[PDB]
Amino acid sequence: MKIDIHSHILPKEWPDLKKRFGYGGWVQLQHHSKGEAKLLKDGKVFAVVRENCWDPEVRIREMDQKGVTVQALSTVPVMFSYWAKPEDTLNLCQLLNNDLASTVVSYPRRFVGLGTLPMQAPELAVKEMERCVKELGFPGVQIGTHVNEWDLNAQELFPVYAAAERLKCSLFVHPWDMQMDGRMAKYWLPWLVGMPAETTIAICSMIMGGVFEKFPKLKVCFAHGGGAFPFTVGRISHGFSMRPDLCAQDNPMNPKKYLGSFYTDALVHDPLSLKLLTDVIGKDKVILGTDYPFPLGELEPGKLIESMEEFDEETKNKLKAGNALAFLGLER
Amino acid sequence: MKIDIHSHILPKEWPDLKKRFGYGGWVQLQHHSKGEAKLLKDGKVFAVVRENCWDPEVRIREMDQKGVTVQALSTVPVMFSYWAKPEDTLNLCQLLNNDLASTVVSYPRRFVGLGTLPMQAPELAVKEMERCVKELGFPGVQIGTHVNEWDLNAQELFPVYAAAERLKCSLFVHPWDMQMDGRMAKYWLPWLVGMPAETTIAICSMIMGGVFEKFPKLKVCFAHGGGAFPFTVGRISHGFSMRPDLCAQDNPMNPKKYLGSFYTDALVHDPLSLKLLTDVIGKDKVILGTDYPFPLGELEPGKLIESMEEFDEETKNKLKAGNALAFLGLER
Ligand SMILES: [Zn+2]
Ligand SMILES: [Zn+2]
């Protein structure tokens, strides 16, 4: 019900990428029947999306109706494409970022853009970041919770962080590329459980990798209330204290010292979790985020926030829009 | 500082297992410096152990300083050995279970036994369970969060649950067998993050698999506060509503509705976490547990509970002792 930091969109169409690049494993969007499109990844329909996933005029009507003022638009994490050749992911990121830039310029009072990067190639990612910031005007980018066998602690990724820091370019971290098969194939576990564990790992990798210590001005927001982190910080903090040989090897400060140093969205569904999220992360560091237009997201944006009896107005306004603005470096 | 539901022990010595069974991957206790030893992978040294890990007099003295009345003894989860040939695994169980019984006989007012079981072979597991309850007098058993490739929903396991429920045998589910390599090899992650993830999966697999609905007298306690579950129940439940096709094919009730139907231990380290845990799981369904003798556990049994200015003495006593007695169907 003011700013939604967490929302995904696709271009309506893009060229056959297998043809474009020479190898398969990409996703396309097919428009078969009305107000619906199939996402495929070699072979199968991966997911069905409705027109709010591509048509910004539809997004505006839904936003008007829900009282959402601005959505920060980012691609669908399936498009990250960190597994492809570096130049080809770059080519794709340019197409998705421009398309994103084009939607934003059409409604620059209702949308901001969070771009995508070829993270598997930190020199290309820096360049594409500069362009997103300087040429495209995006306040930030969305990145995966990991990049192939790299976690957010990886040294290779360090230039990317120094660039983001320097460019005043915010990072929205989104869990992606969990295990989808084996034990994880049933009960939508990769989404229910594997996503919040991915995020929990990412936060851990960034704290214990020293990322926040190297780059104290890096602005970073994690997805879904930081996964399990706000609840298991005790275990993480105490275990860090207990086994510095395994945990304090790169950054000697206890994880608990970085509570306050990063943001999460507020997408945790119940009041008790939200209250704990703010207690643990702080009321300046939690941002309304919705996962629009996906069904695992908040159906009525901001409704969980508005219903918290304990929060005064100032707090509610922080969580709905204020914190978003600090995290993006923009003005109301 | 009355009862500890989560405490692990090993016999002081056991046969060489590479011999007795005739293939590797087992675990052995090697002592070196009088009241100090090391556990071994067959491959290499994983974990340094103190005297308290095998010596019942040593445990009692510490229980006396720390104000612990009773410990529920279970084996070290690395002993589960669900990956091995069944009959072999059974052998190891009877050996570990008789040791456990033999230690309880020495201090019947200070220890109870929680058995292990050849879970990868259901009917053999069943009979060993009847033996643990009828002949050894155990009030329950400890089993892992999954069995090789079966998660706790597997129908193969339903005979074990009916049997457990028949016999009034409580189950303590412990996370084990997380991912140990790849991305998970740094920063003590399989412990700090993989374990809570394992447990969250087990809660989901039992709720969604039909286990609590098909066996309404099964008494089940989860390790470490139930992992992420008390914090992410919101996500897991909203998701279940949004995709009953993906999540409800085996049991149709919303996971939300099984809050109350199971216990967790209180081992969450932080007070905010412990308050959340009781707000979600229930004041009657949280049991003090320490993970004694391991460094990742609570060093002062029940100090966290005692520090909760918001719990009255009735509630402090539920968490310390009254919930464990109820879970195990024992009297004072
Ligand atoms: Zn999302
Ligand atoms: Zn344990």
XYZ file of C-alpha atoms and ligand atoms in Angstrom:
666
model
C 0.000 0.000 0.000
C 2.751 2.514 -0.918
C 6.010 1.100 -2.322
C 6.457 -2.564 -3.389
C 10.163 -3.372 -3.526
C 9.544 -6.939 -4.731
C 7.746 -7.397 -8.068
C 8.612 -9.145 -11.291
C 7.772 -8.501 -14.879
C 8.783 -9.926 -18.309
C 8.936 -8.403 -21.799
C 5.832 -9.401 -23.799
C 8.036 -11.110 -26.435
C 11.728 -11.729 -27.047
C 13.583 -13.594 -29.787
C 14.205 -17.359 -29.760
C 17.392 -17.405 -27.650
C 18.503 -20.849 -28.671
C 18.606 -19.449 -32.207
C 20.196 -16.213 -31.047
C 23.030 -17.832 -29.112
C 23.472 -21.351 -30.498
C 22.528 -23.553 -27.513
C 19.347 -24.491 -25.659
C 18.342 -24.240 -21.977
C 16.779 -20.720 -22.160
C 13.219 -19.679 -21.402
C 10.595 -18.382 -23.849
C 7.180 -16.934 -23.343
C 4.405 -18.180 -25.627
C 1.115 -16.384 -26.247
C -1.383 -19.169 -27.012
C -4.879 -18.136 -25.625
C -6.243 -14.914 -24.101
C -4.727 -13.101 -21.076
C -2.314 -15.992 -20.495
C 1.154 -17.087 -21.602
C 3.247 -20.241 -21.140
C 6.823 -20.047 -19.913
C 8.893 -22.905 -21.338
C 12.406 -24.205 -20.530
C 13.584 -26.861 -22.937
C 10.616 -29.204 -23.218
C 7.990 -28.249 -20.724
C 5.676 -25.491 -19.658
C 7.492 -24.289 -16.499
C 4.711 -21.872 -15.397
C 1.603 -20.058 -16.592
C 1.504 -16.278 -16.211
C -1.295 -13.803 -16.780
C -1.052 -10.457 -18.540
C -0.112 -8.570 -15.325
C 3.273 -10.244 -15.787
C 4.012 -8.289 -18.984
C 1.457 -5.592 -19.664
C 2.190 -2.520 -17.575
C -1.278 -1.011 -18.160
C -2.769 -3.979 -16.359
C -0.187 -3.548 -13.585
C -1.258 0.054 -13.160
C -4.923 -0.844 -12.776
C -4.184 -3.545 -10.149
C -1.879 -0.996 -8.389
C -4.572 1.727 -8.412
C -6.988 -0.853 -6.962
C -4.571 -2.028 -4.237
C -3.371 1.465 -3.363
C 0.211 0.630 -4.446
C 2.008 3.836 -5.573
C 5.204 2.441 -6.996
C 6.445 -1.028 -7.893
C 10.218 -1.596 -8.258
C 10.272 -3.868 -11.286
C 12.774 -6.709 -11.661
C 12.995 -9.607 -14.022
C 11.831 -13.054 -13.123
C 14.715 -14.864 -11.413
C 14.479 -17.688 -13.949
C 15.979 -15.151 -16.460
C 19.177 -14.651 -14.437
C 20.895 -17.065 -16.809
C 24.162 -17.291 -14.796
C 24.880 -20.663 -16.373
C 25.244 -19.416 -19.976
C 28.337 -18.085 -21.836
C 29.261 -14.639 -20.239
C 28.655 -12.523 -23.460
C 25.291 -14.157 -24.142
C 23.976 -13.507 -20.639
C 25.214 -9.944 -21.137
C 23.259 -9.694 -24.435
C 20.163 -10.959 -22.652
C 20.620 -8.598 -19.711
C 20.818 -5.715 -22.126
C 17.562 -6.691 -23.749
C 15.822 -7.164 -20.348
C 17.240 -3.983 -18.888
C 16.283 -1.853 -21.858
C 12.817 -3.347 -21.864
C 12.673 -2.560 -18.113
C 14.015 0.952 -18.805
C 11.215 1.351 -21.436
C 8.385 0.431 -19.010
C 9.792 2.834 -16.391
C 10.042 5.817 -18.732
C 6.331 5.243 -19.572
C 5.316 5.627 -15.937
C 8.300 7.087 -13.994
C 6.000 8.063 -11.125
C 4.664 4.468 -10.722
C 7.743 2.264 -11.473
C 11.503 2.124 -10.746
C 13.763 -0.489 -12.408
C 16.030 -3.097 -10.681
C 18.252 -4.427 -13.385
C 19.789 -7.847 -14.070
C 23.565 -8.637 -14.506
C 25.824 -11.330 -15.983
C 27.118 -12.183 -12.458
C 29.158 -15.186 -13.714
C 31.469 -12.555 -15.311
C 32.193 -9.766 -12.830
C 33.863 -7.493 -15.405
C 30.793 -7.624 -17.713
C 28.546 -7.195 -14.640
C 30.350 -4.008 -13.552
C 29.988 -2.575 -17.111
C 26.301 -3.468 -17.363
C 25.845 -2.025 -13.853
C 27.391 1.376 -14.895
C 25.082 1.463 -17.840
C 22.034 0.559 -15.696
C 22.967 3.325 -13.304
C 24.267 6.029 -15.745
C 22.447 5.391 -18.991
C 19.273 3.713 -17.640
C 18.844 5.633 -14.376
C 18.055 2.417 -12.303
C 18.621 2.890 -8.538
C 19.621 -0.781 -8.138
C 19.893 -4.320 -9.469
C 18.425 -7.713 -8.468
C 20.909 -10.632 -8.136
C 20.665 -14.334 -7.211
C 21.486 -15.728 -3.786
C 24.330 -17.593 -5.489
C 26.121 -17.556 -8.834
C 26.880 -21.118 -10.034
C 29.340 -22.559 -7.381
C 29.946 -19.014 -6.091
C 28.302 -17.733 -2.962
C 28.064 -14.033 -2.178
C 31.262 -14.341 -0.268
C 33.302 -15.125 -3.389
C 36.279 -12.857 -3.993
C 35.615 -12.917 -7.736
C 32.365 -11.033 -6.966
C 34.202 -8.404 -4.941
C 34.705 -5.967 -7.917
C 30.931 -6.086 -8.515
C 30.357 -4.952 -4.870
C 32.973 -2.177 -5.033
C 31.240 -0.922 -8.228
C 27.753 -1.072 -6.613
C 29.077 0.732 -3.589
C 30.739 3.415 -5.707
C 27.754 3.791 -8.042
C 25.315 4.084 -5.136
C 23.675 1.021 -6.668
C 21.456 -0.950 -4.344
C 21.338 -4.821 -4.357
C 18.112 -6.744 -4.100
C 19.051 -10.352 -3.455
C 16.567 -12.992 -4.534
C 16.761 -16.718 -3.888
C 17.047 -18.723 -7.040
C 18.455 -21.943 -8.356
C 17.563 -24.246 -5.434
C 17.452 -27.997 -5.849
C 14.229 -28.787 -7.743
C 14.427 -32.593 -7.835
C 15.250 -35.529 -5.514
C 13.658 -35.074 -2.079
C 12.810 -31.503 -3.116
C 10.412 -32.515 -5.961
C 7.219 -32.700 -3.860
C 5.070 -30.293 -1.763
C 6.524 -27.198 -3.580
C 9.445 -27.468 -1.151
C 11.959 -25.540 -3.307
C 9.677 -22.498 -2.951
C 8.359 -23.044 0.566
C 11.645 -24.091 2.161
C 14.484 -24.094 -0.321
C 13.970 -20.385 -1.103
C 14.185 -19.206 2.477
C 17.259 -21.415 3.018
C 18.985 -19.952 -0.047
C 18.494 -16.518 1.411
C 19.737 -17.617 4.833
C 22.900 -18.934 3.207
C 23.390 -15.730 1.225
C 23.118 -13.576 4.343
C 25.598 -15.858 6.096
C 27.970 -15.772 3.175
C 27.890 -12.008 3.032
C 28.421 -11.539 6.772
C 31.120 -14.176 7.234
C 32.708 -13.261 3.920
C 33.245 -9.733 5.240
C 31.237 -8.108 2.453
C 29.581 -5.659 4.736
C 32.917 -4.921 6.439
C 34.743 -4.181 3.106
C 31.896 -2.142 1.708
C 30.056 -0.435 4.636
C 28.055 1.701 2.228
C 26.817 -1.163 0.095
C 23.041 -1.181 0.344
C 21.585 -4.700 0.238
C 18.057 -6.060 0.623
C 17.219 -9.703 1.036
C 14.040 -11.421 -0.122
C 11.167 -12.862 1.963
C 12.180 -11.328 5.286
C 15.716 -12.748 4.997
C 14.588 -16.407 4.867
C 15.060 -18.195 8.207
C 17.802 -15.791 9.298
C 15.855 -13.662 11.771
C 14.829 -16.783 13.706
C 18.133 -18.768 13.446
C 20.481 -15.801 14.009
C 20.902 -17.155 17.546
C 22.173 -20.479 16.392
C 24.298 -18.734 13.706
C 25.744 -16.164 16.091
C 26.460 -18.644 18.861
C 27.963 -21.221 16.548
C 30.157 -18.484 15.051
C 31.290 -17.716 18.639
C 31.807 -21.437 19.354
C 33.808 -22.366 16.231
C 35.831 -19.302 14.976
C 38.114 -21.791 13.200
C 35.290 -22.570 10.741
C 33.418 -19.236 10.944
C 35.596 -16.249 11.848
C 38.277 -17.141 9.273
C 37.391 -14.166 6.898
C 35.495 -11.739 9.173
C 36.125 -11.709 12.937
C 32.944 -9.845 13.992
C 29.979 -11.882 15.204
C 27.062 -11.935 12.712
C 24.886 -10.168 15.302
C 26.969 -6.979 14.752
C 25.518 -6.652 11.272
C 21.940 -6.617 12.434
C 21.142 -3.060 11.303
C 23.464 -3.156 8.274
C 21.018 -4.529 5.687
C 17.422 -4.645 4.715
C 14.953 -7.365 4.020
C 11.494 -7.137 2.387
C 8.594 -7.753 4.742
C 7.176 -10.668 2.842
C 6.671 -13.182 5.754
C 2.821 -13.530 5.822
C 2.053 -13.660 9.550
C 2.034 -10.887 12.174
C 4.265 -12.829 14.617
C 6.954 -13.227 11.941
C 6.676 -9.607 10.943
C 7.010 -8.465 14.571
C 10.074 -10.670 14.996
C 11.505 -9.421 11.673
C 11.317 -5.821 12.839
C 12.659 -6.670 16.332
C 15.604 -8.424 14.799
C 16.309 -6.337 11.672
C 15.004 -3.011 12.964
C 12.150 -0.823 11.885
C 14.305 1.158 9.455
C 15.505 -1.935 7.621
C 12.275 -3.815 6.680
C 10.638 -2.895 3.336
C 7.136 -3.717 1.986
C 7.518 -6.232 -0.765
C 4.922 -8.391 -2.358
C 6.184 -10.855 -5.034
C 3.583 -9.518 -7.479
C 2.253 -11.034 -9.561
C 3.067 -14.474 -8.153
C 0.578 -16.356 -6.023
C 3.075 -17.121 -3.224
C 3.157 -13.291 -2.662
C 0.997 -10.931 -0.598
C -2.460 -10.817 -2.226
C -3.412 -7.558 -0.508
C -0.270 -5.406 -0.509
C 0.554 -3.810 2.857
C -2.389 -5.441 4.597
C -0.149 -7.419 7.003
C 1.658 -4.155 7.883
C -1.576 -2.066 8.393
C -3.052 -4.720 10.706
C -0.196 -4.684 13.235
C -1.827 -3.063 16.282
C 1.490 -2.481 18.054
C 3.058 -0.336 15.334
C 2.394 3.409 15.383
C 1.871 5.456 12.222
C 5.488 6.392 11.740
C 6.548 2.763 11.811
C 3.821 1.711 9.389
C 4.869 4.505 7.002
C 8.501 3.363 7.269
C 7.629 -0.180 6.289
C 5.249 0.850 3.441
C 7.412 3.475 1.736
C 9.965 5.243 3.957
C 12.483 2.416 4.135
C 12.106 1.632 0.444
C 13.165 5.247 -0.314
C 16.191 5.145 1.948
C 17.226 1.821 0.443
C 16.759 3.177 -3.138
C 18.215 6.673 -2.481
C 15.126 8.470 -3.852
C 12.692 11.115 -2.563
C 8.950 11.068 -2.062
C 17.593 -27.097 34.804
C 15.248 -30.085 35.392
C 14.933 -32.171 32.181
C 17.084 -32.204 29.018
C 15.348 -33.856 26.046
C 18.317 -33.477 23.666
C 21.511 -35.059 24.843
C 23.771 -37.477 22.953
C 25.950 -40.297 24.180
C 28.239 -43.043 22.910
C 29.348 -46.297 24.496
C 32.988 -45.902 25.636
C 34.011 -48.491 23.026
C 32.535 -50.598 20.191
C 33.743 -53.291 17.694
C 35.657 -52.278 14.576
C 32.836 -51.933 12.009
C 34.761 -52.110 8.696
C 35.625 -55.644 9.903
C 32.405 -56.728 11.654
C 30.394 -55.704 8.535
C 32.963 -55.702 5.684
C 32.883 -52.254 4.020
C 33.785 -48.714 5.113
C 32.053 -45.436 6.056
C 31.394 -46.244 9.704
C 32.362 -44.427 12.826
C 34.857 -45.325 15.602
C 35.902 -43.861 18.932
C 39.654 -43.400 19.415
C 40.881 -42.196 22.815
C 44.302 -40.621 23.282
C 44.835 -38.465 26.419
C 42.824 -39.818 29.445
C 39.323 -38.268 29.273
C 39.791 -37.035 25.658
C 39.040 -38.749 22.299
C 38.254 -38.290 18.573
C 35.513 -39.569 16.231
C 36.556 -40.845 12.809
C 34.872 -41.046 9.400
C 36.694 -44.246 8.336
C 38.164 -41.509 6.076
C 39.079 -38.881 8.724
C 38.677 -37.125 12.083
C 35.298 -35.476 12.302
C 34.641 -34.017 15.839
C 36.827 -33.904 18.974
C 35.017 -35.425 22.000
C 35.431 -35.007 25.749
C 34.937 -37.532 28.566
C 31.301 -36.421 29.127
C 30.418 -37.998 25.769
C 30.691 -41.608 27.048
C 31.167 -41.572 30.786
C 28.012 -41.599 32.865
C 29.702 -40.442 36.163
C 31.192 -37.527 34.329
C 27.756 -36.627 32.949
C 26.114 -36.845 36.438
C 28.662 -34.484 38.065
C 28.081 -31.860 35.330
C 24.319 -32.470 35.611
C 24.695 -31.733 39.334
C 26.569 -28.457 38.850
C 24.218 -27.399 36.031
C 21.089 -28.341 38.091
C 19.912 -30.998 35.515
C 17.687 -33.695 37.010
C 17.311 -35.955 33.991
C 18.868 -36.363 30.572
C 17.187 -38.205 27.718
C 20.043 -40.154 26.193
C 20.163 -40.720 22.434
C 23.039 -41.778 20.246
C 25.135 -39.360 18.183
C 23.126 -38.876 14.939
C 26.189 -39.827 12.813
C 25.414 -43.349 14.189
C 22.029 -43.519 12.407
C 23.661 -45.376 9.483
C 20.480 -45.544 7.401
C 22.773 -45.788 4.262
C 24.011 -49.304 5.198
C 22.629 -52.819 4.575
C 19.658 -53.292 6.883
C 20.574 -56.344 9.002
C 23.928 -54.714 9.692
C 22.285 -51.453 10.736
C 19.971 -53.468 13.033
C 22.982 -55.113 14.689
C 24.461 -51.670 15.445
C 21.143 -50.530 16.861
C 20.742 -53.411 19.320
C 24.341 -52.724 20.426
C 23.630 -48.997 20.950
C 20.257 -49.620 22.458
C 21.541 -52.171 25.014
C 24.293 -49.750 25.985
C 21.690 -47.026 26.451
C 19.546 -49.394 28.558
C 22.616 -50.334 30.594
C 23.455 -46.735 31.415
C 19.794 -46.062 32.483
C 19.909 -49.102 34.776
C 22.923 -47.476 36.490
C 21.025 -44.205 37.136
C 17.298 -44.900 36.689
C 16.351 -41.598 38.289
C 18.782 -39.525 36.162
C 18.516 -40.992 32.633
C 15.905 -42.253 30.228
C 16.686 -43.913 26.909
C 15.820 -42.827 23.373
C 16.554 -45.698 20.999
C 17.878 -45.734 17.470
C 16.234 -47.896 14.687
C 17.075 -49.453 11.254
C 14.688 -46.955 9.591
C 15.669 -47.888 6.003
C 14.069 -51.268 6.724
C 10.604 -50.577 8.254
C 9.557 -53.984 9.568
C 12.948 -54.613 11.246
C 12.702 -51.128 12.651
C 9.199 -51.948 13.978
C 10.396 -54.997 15.932
C 13.456 -53.241 17.419
C 11.012 -50.549 18.528
C 8.867 -53.177 20.294
C 12.032 -54.453 21.892
C 13.101 -50.858 22.932
C 9.717 -50.297 24.578
C 8.721 -53.702 25.935
C 12.111 -55.148 26.919
C 14.345 -52.120 27.526
C 11.642 -49.749 28.837
C 12.465 -46.769 26.599
C 9.709 -44.111 26.370
C 10.649 -43.260 22.791
C 13.176 -43.241 20.002
C 15.334 -40.737 18.100
C 15.265 -40.947 14.266
C 16.640 -38.648 11.535
C 14.850 -36.015 9.499
C 14.794 -38.285 6.405
C 15.788 -41.829 5.541
C 18.181 -42.042 2.534
C 15.626 -40.977 -0.033
C 12.446 -41.275 1.946
C 11.296 -38.187 3.644
C 9.050 -38.641 6.684
C 5.912 -38.673 4.476
C 6.989 -41.958 2.747
C 4.284 -44.661 2.931
C 7.021 -47.232 3.601
C 7.282 -45.594 7.044
C 3.668 -45.700 8.021
C 4.081 -49.150 9.657
C 6.773 -47.603 11.984
C 4.388 -44.730 12.963
C 1.384 -47.015 13.565
C 3.712 -49.138 15.677
C 5.104 -46.067 17.449
C 1.575 -44.898 18.105
C 0.437 -48.438 19.072
C 3.159 -48.621 21.667
C 2.921 -45.071 23.044
C 6.458 -44.532 21.771
C 7.506 -40.911 21.433
C 9.675 -39.742 18.504
C 12.450 -37.190 18.635
C 13.334 -36.198 15.068
C 16.878 -35.013 14.666
C 18.348 -33.397 11.605
C 21.122 -35.399 9.997
C 22.663 -36.085 6.683
C 22.558 -32.476 5.408
C 24.674 -31.613 2.371
C 28.303 -31.702 3.572
C 30.206 -30.663 0.425
C 30.124 -28.163 -2.455
C 28.758 -24.730 -1.470
C 27.890 -26.106 1.962
C 31.572 -26.850 2.956
C 32.339 -23.360 4.314
C 31.353 -21.430 7.439
C 29.909 -24.458 9.273
C 26.764 -24.129 7.134
C 25.450 -27.705 7.279
C 25.247 -27.141 11.009
C 24.190 -23.553 11.181
C 21.762 -23.628 8.283
C 21.445 -27.158 6.815
C 20.118 -28.652 10.099
C 17.237 -26.148 10.557
C 16.476 -26.719 6.852
C 16.442 -30.484 7.311
C 13.968 -30.093 10.218
C 11.689 -27.654 8.395
C 11.470 -30.242 5.641
C 10.581 -32.933 8.134
C 7.788 -30.856 9.664
C 6.406 -30.160 6.173
C 6.747 -33.815 5.126
C 4.825 -35.047 8.165
C 2.150 -32.391 7.967
C 1.633 -32.606 4.200
C 2.258 -36.348 4.036
C -0.769 -37.101 6.271
C 1.241 -38.425 9.266
C -0.395 -36.344 12.017
C -3.802 -36.869 10.508
C -3.510 -40.612 10.090
C -1.968 -41.066 13.600
C -3.501 -38.488 16.021
C -1.750 -39.949 19.060
C 1.759 -39.982 17.559
C 4.011 -37.989 19.934
C 6.680 -36.252 17.923
C 9.241 -33.644 18.991
C 11.539 -31.811 16.487
C 15.187 -30.653 17.167
C 16.283 -27.001 17.458
C 13.015 -25.221 17.850
C 11.749 -26.869 14.677
C 14.318 -25.223 12.480
C 12.898 -22.369 10.366
C 9.351 -23.642 10.709
C 8.072 -21.316 13.521
C 9.159 -18.358 11.500
C 8.219 -19.611 7.988
C 4.929 -21.343 8.867
C 3.324 -18.259 7.364
C 4.933 -18.864 3.968
C 4.422 -22.640 4.088
C 0.699 -22.231 4.952
C -0.077 -19.440 2.461
C 1.622 -21.512 -0.178
C -0.352 -24.576 0.685
C -3.573 -22.569 0.148
C -2.385 -21.142 -3.206
C -1.343 -24.476 -4.701
C -3.492 -27.333 -3.333
C -2.496 -29.130 -6.529
C 1.194 -29.012 -5.576
C 0.868 -29.494 -1.792
C -2.395 -31.149 -0.813
C -2.477 -34.375 -2.860
C -1.715 -36.515 0.293
C -3.380 -34.575 3.187
C -5.800 -31.651 2.665
C -5.720 -29.632 5.940
C -3.779 -26.424 6.107
C -0.385 -26.908 7.922
C -1.508 -23.976 10.117
C -3.984 -26.370 11.729
C -1.217 -28.680 13.126
C 0.280 -26.037 15.361
C -0.336 -27.748 18.677
C -0.087 -31.296 17.276
C 3.682 -31.643 17.859
C 6.513 -30.521 20.130
C 9.883 -28.956 19.485
C 12.848 -28.542 21.812
C 13.596 -25.037 23.183
C 17.114 -24.922 21.782
C 17.008 -21.625 19.875
C 19.726 -19.575 21.730
C 17.962 -16.130 21.533
C 15.065 -14.949 23.722
C 13.150 -13.302 20.766
C 13.363 -16.649 19.014
C 12.225 -18.497 22.177
C 9.274 -16.138 22.670
C 8.288 -16.699 18.958
C 8.686 -20.389 19.321
C 6.248 -20.512 22.248
C 3.821 -18.032 20.613
C 3.711 -20.363 17.581
C 4.324 -23.954 18.746
C 2.745 -23.485 22.217
C 3.687 -23.115 25.906
C 2.722 -26.829 26.447
C 4.704 -28.088 23.430
C 8.260 -26.675 23.837
C 10.732 -28.881 25.704
C 14.123 -27.784 27.139
C 16.930 -29.473 25.244
C 20.606 -28.738 25.207
C 22.456 -30.862 22.622
C 24.830 -31.771 25.491
C 27.787 -32.384 25.229
C 28.283 -30.492 21.936
C 29.698 -26.964 21.733
C 26.776 -25.924 19.473
C 24.318 -26.584 22.404
C 23.241 -24.474 25.464
C 26.125 -24.298 27.948
C 23.967 -23.385 30.891
C 20.940 -25.666 30.609
C 17.833 -23.565 30.907
C 19.544 -20.220 31.500
C 17.655 -18.844 28.414
C 14.305 -20.068 29.758
C 15.038 -18.628 33.226
C 15.897 -15.200 31.650
C 12.441 -14.709 30.199
C 10.956 -12.051 32.513
C 7.735 -12.614 30.515
C 7.185 -16.296 31.418
C 5.640 -16.971 34.846
C 6.944 -19.826 37.017
C 4.284 -22.307 35.770
C 5.408 -21.633 32.167
C 9.149 -21.749 33.071
C 8.441 -25.127 34.640
C 6.581 -26.403 31.631
C 9.618 -25.722 29.427
C 12.126 -27.117 31.959
C 10.388 -30.326 32.929
C 6.557 -30.619 32.634
C 6.511 -30.701 28.822
C 9.214 -33.386 28.623
C 7.287 -35.634 31.041
C 4.122 -35.196 28.995
C 5.874 -35.848 25.683
C 7.420 -39.050 27.057
C 4.356 -40.114 29.096
C 6.359 -40.279 32.354
C 5.469 -39.232 35.918
C 7.561 -37.574 38.704
Zn 10.177 -12.968 -6.127
Zn 21.721 -33.062 18.658
